[PDB]
């Protein structure tokens, strides 16, 4: 078979027939006359005023004469060359209230322009460097920063950005990466990685064809040019109705391959800004000479951004354990540990806080703060470290490849955890269906798939997005979200049983809602039996089957009082007449259990008088909690909360427990749960959560805010012992604040691993919640 008529060509061909797609070389696949026919290179990519009007020449890359309009194989700055028109970069701002698009467009197309490690930070550079790029940013719709996914490598992150989905949910969780079951790796090079068995979730290209959207081919093989892709994404925008796509994607290797060369601050990094500016100007330029730039819609979109990194800065696990040769390590700013083909424990135990200014930290995955939701997977090895920013880790010194000079390679690197500066990259959307010259705040890439979708009119596939906290990001939504229905209601009771019946083995020595509750009851959104328990000082959630609270919630002023617990209180439970006894905990089950101990949810330390405080000491207030954990919790209850409080002008906290024994993000039924206080079914917190919110305008108290809420979680593990935290001999004030930051979280995150939902009765839109309930405190801003 010809290429002949057929460069490009939308369909593919299955063999033995050849083929003349995007595609055919990375499958060996191309017709003969490949390579002469579309990968023409003659004169380059830009018009020159000696070609204008010249006598067409077939071997040119892109034409210059009389006739490349009506032919539609133009160069991008023809018109701007020999028609005197000006570049799209030089045209004043002006408004896209509606898409502008020719006669038989059904809907506005999207572009997306992906930029691998482009840091946010870069677009600090301005037009100087990348006038297109800016203006698209200052026109259009633009976030400060968009948060990648862990680990923040291009192939977890680009197929999160097609997908919605965390990388344990599908499947790429590196660059690198070994499944036990196919007894096989994933690479970069090689073709491991062109097998479909994983590559799990719905990406978008499939999504659009399932529901009759053209997507037509995203993958371009490698040696095709950047300039040759633009020329033929402006190609299939001309085709007729029935063949042009709605969807297309643009990927540049810049600036990454760079960054990694010569850091990301380096005096070199500015070239290849240039490069990449240049190729969007083609784009844009192109789009004009065809009529589309006030038609399509273009996203322009980073994977992850770049750090500075040296062989200098390198731990080598060979300093730490006496047998490195049992072990494979997948290295670098990442740590993934496994055998050869060895003890985790002794493992975990030997890497552990052995050096004074140690660069890397040791995880069993489960044990991973739960924000990055790293751990659902075969493919994620038990043993995890995270490395600190500008840190390797690697197995040996003589593990690490040299240059012939004998210094490592890279100047740069990423891969970090994701809340770190140096990892987050970039975000404008531009066009009829983006806002007009709009910042909106920072926010995660896995929200960009239900956008996409949005974009052209798709029904989103499950994902991890939550659709409608973007909505801000447009000018008309085709979504509008709705609130989840409650499943289960709960019970009011009342006094129900006297204190003689109940024999827990205690002892002690003898306007709720509106000031308790200021964005309404969460909603339960699973079967289950509870109680609705009102005090002068708290209001909880009480599960029947859980035997503790699923959430309690309450008030503090800035100007509330922290008080002592009374020496003669310090044992104090009492039984809580309007539950059952057999729906409570029993203090002997924690007398018997060396392990176990108790704390409250409600401090008694807050309690608004000696009288009410005897309310915190109520056995339904009370949580199973180690004695290593209860310095974590005592010191936030006596000490933090105050704190937030003081500074913040009143906070509402919401507390609780989360079971997650299978470390799936979700919570666990009763079957899940894997530990109990001794003797009991009193089931063990796997974390406790709080969600403490104030007003964003601070100079009002929480409890009269007329406005945006502003609010920070967290997800603390419920440990045995502090071995998380080096300095955890020390006082609290030395340690449990960073311990708390590291377990920052989303409330989002929180819903998933509660079943609750939160803010169901505001004065804002539920669009608006839902951004609130996607934010992140990241305490590096
Ligand atoms: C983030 O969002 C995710 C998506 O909503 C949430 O993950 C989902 O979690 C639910 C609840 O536990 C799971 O429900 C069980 O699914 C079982 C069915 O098995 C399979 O069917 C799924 C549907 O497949 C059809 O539809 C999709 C459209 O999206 C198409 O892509 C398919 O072609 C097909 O038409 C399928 O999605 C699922 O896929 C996984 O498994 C394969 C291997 O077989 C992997 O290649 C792939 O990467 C997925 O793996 C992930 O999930 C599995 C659990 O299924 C984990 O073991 C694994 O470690 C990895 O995390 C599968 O083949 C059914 O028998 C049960 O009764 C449940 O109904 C969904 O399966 C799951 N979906 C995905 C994509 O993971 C996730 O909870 C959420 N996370 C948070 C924190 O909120
Ligand atoms: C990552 C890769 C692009 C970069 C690159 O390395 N180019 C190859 C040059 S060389 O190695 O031959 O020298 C793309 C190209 C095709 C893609 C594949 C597609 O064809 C077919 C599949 C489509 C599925 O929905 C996703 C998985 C799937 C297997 C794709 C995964 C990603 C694939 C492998
Ligand atoms: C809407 C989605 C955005 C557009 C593209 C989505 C495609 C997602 C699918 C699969 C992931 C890989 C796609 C191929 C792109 C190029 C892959 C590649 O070879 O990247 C260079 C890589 O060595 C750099 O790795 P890093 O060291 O992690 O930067
Ligand atoms: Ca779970
Ligand atoms: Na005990
Ligand atoms: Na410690
Ligand atoms: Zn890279």
Not at 190 to 206: A, C, M, S, T, V
Not at 336 to 355: E, F, G, M, N, V
Not at 590 to 609: E, V
Request: contains cysteine; glycine residues 6%.
């Amino acid at each position: 078979g010809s290429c002949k008529g057929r460069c490009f060509e939308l369909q593919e061909v299955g063999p033995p027939d050849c083929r003349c797609d995007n595609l055919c070389k990375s499958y060996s696949s191309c017709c003969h006359d490949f390579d002469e026919l579309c990968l023409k290179t003659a004169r380059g990519w830009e018009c020159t005023k000696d070609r204008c009007g010249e006598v067409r020449n077939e071997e040119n890359a892109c034409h210059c004469s009389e006739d490349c309009l009506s032919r539609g194989d133009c160069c991008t700055n023809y018109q701007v060359v020999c028609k005197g028109e000006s570049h799209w970069v030089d045209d004043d701002c002006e408004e896209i209230k509606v898409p502008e698009c020719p006669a038989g467009f059904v809907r506005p197309p999207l572009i997306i322009f992906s930029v691998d490690g482009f840091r946010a930070s870069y677009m600090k550079k301005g037009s100087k460097v990348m006038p297109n790029i800016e203006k698209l940013r200052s026109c259009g719709t633009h976030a400060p920063y968009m948060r990648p996914v862990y680990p923040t490598k291009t192939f977890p992150n680009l197929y999160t950005l097609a997908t919605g989905l965390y990388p344990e949910s599908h499947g790429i969780v590196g660059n690198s990466m070994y499944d036990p079951v196919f007894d096989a790796s994933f690479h970069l090079r090689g073709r491991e990685k062109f097998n479909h068995r994983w590559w799990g979730g719905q990406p978008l290209w499939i999504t659009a064809t399932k529901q009759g959207v053209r997507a037509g081919t995203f993958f371009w093989s490698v040696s095709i040019p950047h300039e040759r892709r633009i020329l033929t994404i402006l190609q299939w925008l001309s085709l007729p109705d029935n063949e042009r796509p709605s969807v297309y994607a643009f990927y540049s290797e810049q600036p990454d391959f760079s960054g990694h060369k010569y850091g990301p601050f380096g005096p070199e990094m500015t070239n290849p800004l240039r490069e990449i500016d240049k190729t969007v100007g083609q784009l844009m330029d192109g789009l004009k000479q065809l009529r589309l730039h006030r038609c399509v819609n273009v996203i322009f979109v980073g994977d992850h951004g770049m750090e500075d990194v040296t062989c200098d800065r390198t731990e080598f696990l060979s300093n730490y354990l006496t047998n490195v040769d049992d072990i494979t390590l997948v290295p670098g700013t990442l740590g993934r540990i496994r055998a050869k083909s060895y003890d985790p424990k002794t493992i975990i135990a030997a890497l552990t806080c052995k050096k004074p200014d140690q660069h890397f930290k040791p995880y069993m995955k489960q044990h991973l703060p739960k924000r990055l939701h790293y751990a659902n997977n075969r493919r994620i090895e038990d043993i995890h470290l995270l490395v600190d920013r500008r840190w390797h880790v690697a197995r040996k010194p003589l593990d690490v490849y040299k240059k012939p000079s004998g210094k490592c390679f890279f100047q740069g690197d990423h891969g970090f955890d994701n809340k770190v500066n140096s990892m987050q990259t970039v975000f404008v959307g531009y066009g009829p269906t983006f806002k007009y010259r709009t910042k909106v705040p920072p926010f995660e890439n896995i929200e960009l798939y239900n956008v996409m979708c949005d974009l052209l009119g798709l029904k989103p596939a499950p994902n991890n997005g939550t659709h409608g906290s973007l909505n801000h990001l447009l000018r008309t939504n085709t979504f509008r979200p709705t609130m989840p229905d409650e499943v289960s209601r709960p019970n009011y009771p009342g006094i129900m049983y006297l204190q003689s019946e109940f024999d827990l083995g205690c002892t002690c020595d003898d306007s709720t809602k509106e000031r308790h509750l200021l964005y309404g009851r969460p909603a339960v959104l699973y079967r289950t039996s509870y109680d609705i328990l009102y005090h002068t000082d708290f209001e909880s959630g009480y599960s029947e089957i859980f035997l503790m609270p699923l959430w309690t919630s309450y008030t503090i002023s800035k100007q509330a009082e922290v008080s002592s617990i009374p020496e003669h209180l310090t044992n104090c439970v009492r039984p809580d007449v309007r539950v059952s006894p057999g729906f409570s905990q029993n203090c002997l089950a924690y007398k018997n259990d060396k392990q176990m101990s108790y704390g409250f949810l409600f401090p008694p330390y807050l309690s608004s008088s000696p009288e009410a405080k005897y309310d915190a000491f109520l056995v339904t207030n009370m949580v199973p909690m180690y004695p290593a954990f209860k310095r974590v919790w005592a010191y936030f209850q006596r000490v933090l909360v105050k704190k937030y409080a003081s500074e913040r002008n009143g906070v509402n906290v919401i507390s609780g427990p989360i079971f997650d024994y299978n470390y799936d993000g979700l919570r666990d039924t009763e079957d899940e749960i894997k530990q109990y206080v001794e003797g009991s079914s009193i089931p063990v917190p796997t974390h406790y959560y709080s969600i403490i919110t104030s007003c964003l305008d601070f100079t009002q108290p929480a409890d009269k805010c007329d406005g945006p809420l502003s609010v920070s979680s967290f997800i603390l593990p419920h440990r045995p012992d502090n071995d998380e935290s080096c300095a955890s001999s020390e006082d609290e004030s030395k340690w449990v604040e960073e311990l708390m930051k590291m377990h920052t979280a989303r409330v989002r995150d929180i819903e998933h691993l509660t079943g609750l939902d939160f803010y169901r009765k505001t004065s804002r839109s539920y669009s608006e919640i839902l951004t609130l309930k996607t934010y992140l405190h990241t305490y590096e801003s």
